Amino acid sequence: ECLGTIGPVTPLDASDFALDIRMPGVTPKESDTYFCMSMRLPVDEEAFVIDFKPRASMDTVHHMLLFGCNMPSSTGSYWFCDEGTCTDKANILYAWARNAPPTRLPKGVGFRVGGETGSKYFVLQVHYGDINHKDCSGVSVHLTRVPQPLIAGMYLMMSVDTVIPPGEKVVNADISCQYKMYPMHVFAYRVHTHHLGKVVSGYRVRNGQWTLIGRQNPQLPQAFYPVEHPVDVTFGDILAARCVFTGEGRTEATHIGGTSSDEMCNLYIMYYMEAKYALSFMTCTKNVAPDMFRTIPAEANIPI
Ligand SMILES: [Cu+2]
Ligand code: NI
């Protein structure tokens, strides 16, 4: 339901509050419309996101994403996300998929927001699949001023230079970076691709030995799925991902971009670190060890 007079901030206690990020009573007119809206944080000082609660209209809402960033793409009430999510790098915090119920954040793990360096805005993306009434669906977020012993963060792996020729059977997108930070522990993962993607898989390679982080079919509902067994990545380790693509069906060559006729090989690894060692976001857009992919487990090429 639409919040009305009470407003979006509910105090939970002296140092906690719930912030309701909602659609401002939207009415979609087409199938597969993507709406976005932002919420400046209510506190300027640092705070930690410790919990999320979905408030989705189960009929119309396909998936919801929740980002943190400093420059949302529009200064408006809401907008079509084709205009963009954020001008600066948008950090994903939460993915709600229809047919894949999200996993809770471990206790003591939180995303740092606000303050001098955290995210100053939340941006809510709601995808309306099937469609007069006004929709107020969104997420309810649990913020705390209390410093958390473990800090949540995102290691993002994405391809930039992949080129898929038309009708081509199999095209591999290889991403690889060496980890040069304090240890992190992977606890969830999301895969994102468009319609040409067949399988995505991320690994930790340590002394030539591949440890699976996540292996998923990008056509299946793109939520964050929990890691089978939590995995430490440590200074020296190499993170490695592959997306497997097809060109079959396409008439012209497909590159990396933002439209449906474009592609993307995106593995979001969610992790926690020790608060005093923690950093909040890492990105790999390179393939530093290409010849290493000769020993990639065979599972990464077969479709799930
Ligand atoms: Cu995309
Ligand atoms: Ni460990």
Side-chain angles (χ1 to χ4, degrees):
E1 314 308 300
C2 302
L3 290 178
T5 60
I6 74 144
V9 167
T10 296
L12 291 167
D13 94 286
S15 47
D16 289 63
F17 65 92
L19 178 66
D20 272 32
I21 314 155
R22 308 297 198 88
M23 284 289 152
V26 291
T27 314
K29 302 297 173 185
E30 288 165 315
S31 293
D32 264 34
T33 324
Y34 287 82
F35 281 139
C36 280
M37 62 87 54
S38 59
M39 291 272 278
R40 174 89 203 204
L41 263 71
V43 282
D44 211 73
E45 71 155 50
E46 197 170 65
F48 306 78
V49 183
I50 45 170
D51 202 27
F52 304 88
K53 300 290 186 209
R55 297 277 153 71
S57 297
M58 283 312 292
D59 298 25
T60 181
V61 183
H62 184 238
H63 61 280
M64 304 187 302
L65 305 182
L66 186 63
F67 301 95
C69 69
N70 288 359
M71 291 158 77
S73 284
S74 172
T75 61
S77 188
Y78 70 101
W79 69 95
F80 303 90
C81 315
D82 304 11
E83 205 177 309
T85 294
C86 303
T87 314
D88 59 332
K89 277 77 208 72
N91 298 304
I92 192 142
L93 303 183
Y94 183 73
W96 185 85
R98 178 184 279 169
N99 303 323
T103 303
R104 221 212 128 80
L105 273 173
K107 199 207 162 186
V109 170
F111 287 101
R112 77 209 304 163
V113 291
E116 285 167 284
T117 47
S119 303
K120 299 307 284 166
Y121 288 86
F122 286 129
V123 183
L124 172 74
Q125 184 172 47
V126 177
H127 172 229
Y128 296 97
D130 174 46
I131 63 159
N132 70 294
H133 91 269
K134 290 177 155 287
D135 185 271
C136 288
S137 290
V139 190
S140 178
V141 176
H142 189 146
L143 285 318
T144 194
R145 283 148 145 273
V146 176
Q148 297 299 308
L150 296 156
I151 294 289
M154 204 60 69
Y155 198 109
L156 165 60
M157 296 188 84
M158 84 191 303
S159 300
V160 285
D161 70 324
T162 322
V163 189
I164 313 162
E168 179 76 47
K169 186 180 167 174
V170 166
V171 193
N172 292 153
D174 293 355
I175 333 171
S176 79
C177 290
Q178 196 171 44
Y179 191 89
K180 271 182 146 97
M181 302 299 149
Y182 268 99
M184 57 159 180
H185 283 78
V186 190
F187 66 91
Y189 74 98
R190 188 171 167 274
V191 303
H192 175 80
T193 258
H194 297 168
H195 281 129
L196 297 186
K198 287 290 180 290
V199 59
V200 187
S201 345
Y203 295 81
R204 181 202 75 193
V205 186
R206 181 178 295 175
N207 298 260
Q209 167 158 317
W210 300 67
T211 301
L212 178 60
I213 289 163
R215 190 169 151 277
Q216 187 60 276
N217 178 25
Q219 303 313 317
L220 259 46
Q222 307 198 328
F224 275 93
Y225 292 96
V227 166
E228 23 40 67
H229 323 81
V231 161
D232 72 287
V233 187
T234 297
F235 204 118
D237 290 351
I238 299 154
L239 289 159
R242 161 169 294 168
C243 303
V244 184
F245 290 104
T246 314
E248 283 165 352
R250 292 298 163 97
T251 176
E252 288 168 353
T254 312
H255 57 102
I256 304 285
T259 71
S260 62
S261 59
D262 282 333
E263 271 305 327
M264 264 179 184
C265 173
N266 278 208
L267 173 61
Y268 306 81
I269 297 160
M270 203 188 278
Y271 64 79
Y272 66 75
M273 299 168 74
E274 300 298 335
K276 74 156 156 192
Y277 302 148
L279 77 167
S280 261
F281 36 83
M282 282 167 279
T283 316
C284 181
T285 51
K286 285 186 286 190
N287 184 351
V288 294
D291 294 323
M292 179 200 60
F293 280 87
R294 288 183 295 207
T295 57
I296 195 170
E299 55 166 9
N301 297 307
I302 68 163
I304 161 77

